[PDB]
Amino acid sequence: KPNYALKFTLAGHTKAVSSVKFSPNGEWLASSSADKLIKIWGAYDGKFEKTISGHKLGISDVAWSSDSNLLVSASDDKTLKIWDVSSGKCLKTLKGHSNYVFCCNFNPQSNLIVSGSFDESVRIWDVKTGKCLKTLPAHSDPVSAVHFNRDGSLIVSSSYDGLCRIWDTASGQCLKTLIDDDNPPVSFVKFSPNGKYILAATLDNTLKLWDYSKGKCLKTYTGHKNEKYCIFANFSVTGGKWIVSGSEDNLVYIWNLQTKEIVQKLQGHTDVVISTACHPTENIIASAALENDKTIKLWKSDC
Amino acid sequence: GCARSRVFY
């Protein structure tokens, strides 16, 4: 079992925090917020680094390029923005979604950005030019998450419509659809670091580890509260192999990935823990919470 | 606010 202990509470956003992501190089934490701002913090000392601004509505997601130099953000203003981290300048504005942009990610080579939107589409964008290369008619309801696999050849998307879909990046064709016979809305999805599995949250308080090729549910994680919001979940791999997720009871939940037992709950947030992130090399978790809380917490474990 | 901090759809 891990022993995550609180190290820092990061205050400064004036509305709900929506998303936190560690830079691939481990130096930085980026956070997006309903307050329209991105904030950059030191990953190891919690020190505020800078504020990046320009979205004229709130931001639901943010993501790092693989070389840690760029960020992409997704906003209620229907655009994504590509930012140069060092300068804080907006390098591109990605236009073409017709409703809120909900989620975003670079591919590993970081020449592409994938976005999902309330307009029910998944868009694939060229980073260099800001051009939209593809609009995928992905879902029949808002798209809650989009994620590339380890080589960028696959995209996984999830939606309130209840489906998890796997797309061939190059052709844009849907390779696989996962269904649950029930339609719980699917609120989050990502590939496992190896790309063999998909981790899917549904709004029935349930996380599931899937083999997408086989189409089998391997693992179920429960005990947390998730019925209303799209909460990020994570594979923790730097120490023990955990599943990490926020929860609507204001706790961070940590499960043993293989046994599915809950191994730790992190207490201290005072609103829904909407987002968690796992540091790439250290046993460090970042968590962030909604309007009653507005803070980010950094937690450290010996394993 | 932002879409993710509001109750999903």
Author numbering:
A (entry chain A): 32 to 334
B (entry chain D): 1745 to 1753
Task: Provide the publication's sentences verbatim.
Two separate and non-overlapping sites located on opposite surfaces of WDR5 mediate most of its interactions with binding partners: an arginine-bearing cavity located on the surface known as the WDR5-interacting (WIN) site, and a shallow cleft on the opposite side referred to as the WDR5-binding (WBM) site. In mice, methyl-CpG binding domain 3 isoform C (MBD3C) interacts specifically with the histone H3 binding protein WD repeat-containing protein 5 (WDR5) and forms the WDR5-MBD3C/Norde complex. The residues Val31-Cys334 of WDR5 are visible and consist of seven WD40 repeats that form a seven-bladed β-propeller structure.
To test this hypothesis, we crystallized the WDR5-SET1B1745-1754 (E1750R/G1751V) complex. Structural analysis revealed that Arg1750 in the SET1B1745-1754 (E1750R/G1751V) peptide forms salt bridges with WDR5 Asp107. Van der Waals contacts are observed between the side chain of Val1751 in the peptide and the aliphatic portions of WDR5 Lys259 and Tyr260. The backbone amide group of Phe1752 in the SET1B1745-1754 (E1750R/G1751V) peptide forms a hydrogen bond with the carbonyl oxygen of WDR5 Lys259. In addition, the side chain of Phe1752 points into the WDR5 Tyr191-related B site. Consequently, it is evident that the WDR5 WIN site and B site could be recognized simultaneously by WIN motif peptides containing the ′′Arg-Cys/Ser-Arg-Val-Phe′′ sequence.
